[PDB]
């Protein structure tokens, strides 16, 4: 590829068909068989399938980089070095104007469904490029066409949805996942279709959405409660944030996010709001039902600690899908 980037540097700055029919075809083949060896890598049921995304992972806080663990995929280095290479004989075959032309061409002789396996591919370079819009119709193509590739298209549909400010579409993406997701448990990551990679992900993803809509100077009280549910997830990550809110609500003193004792099984969740209550954290006023009522039923909730985290909160993210009202901003 880079002796002909030199060869066709010389060949393109300025019939000569032997030089543009090389950077072509030989282009065509180097191309199909990266992209092959690419989702024979990631959803190999073509031939856990393996999605590109975009994970968030500080929300507590041509040179885009895939961040995937070594565990995950092992023989991630030549499956990206892969991907990159064929994504630059892309870029090659689409840069210069005859070689764009005559690639469209032959692309479009073969099968121009890019059956799945080359479909899968474009939606995972373009996801890559920066580029969501054309990544999304291309995932739309591969649902078309088309947890297995199901949970494909929707986790990478949410993370082509995400694209730095949008935060709706991709939560009701993200919604409509786990209905295929059920189970008891900051740049590009490269995570299976399974949930130990993408529950977390998902979480990160309504976190940050929540975060981003609560912490605006307004008076939303869903969004904070919505926030703190979240928060739970990766103690003690979300100790800084739990203490923005809480310093927030002194502030304020009217939250008000009935079904509040049915998502929050955290020890120190009650231990400071009960502080908030007494005298000292303020006297915040606590409407978290829908005076002995309240306590009584922090002593219930008190009781579900444990009540494994991610049960929990798949329980409010499915029971709960009216979030999207609030998920508005």
Known sequence: LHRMKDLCRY????????????????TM????KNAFQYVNSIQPSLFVPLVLLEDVSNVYGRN??????????????????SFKLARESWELLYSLEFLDKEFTRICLAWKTDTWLWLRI?????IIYQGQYKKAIASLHHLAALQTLEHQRALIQLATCHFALGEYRMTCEKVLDLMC????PISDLKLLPCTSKAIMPYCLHLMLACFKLRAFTDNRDDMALGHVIVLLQQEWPRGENLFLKAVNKICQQGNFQYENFFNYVTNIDMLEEFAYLRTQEGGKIHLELLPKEDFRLAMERQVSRCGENLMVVLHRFCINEKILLLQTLT
């Open 11 to 26: 060949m393109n700055n300025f019939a000569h068909a032997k030089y543009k029919n090389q950077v072509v075809y030989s």
């Open 29 to 32: 083949l180097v191309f199909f």
């Open 64 to 81: 885009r980089h895939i961040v995937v663990n070594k565990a995950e995929l092992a023989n991630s280095t030549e499956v990206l070095e």
């Open 121 to 125: 591919f474009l939606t995972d370079m």
């Open 180 to 183: 295929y997701m059920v189970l």
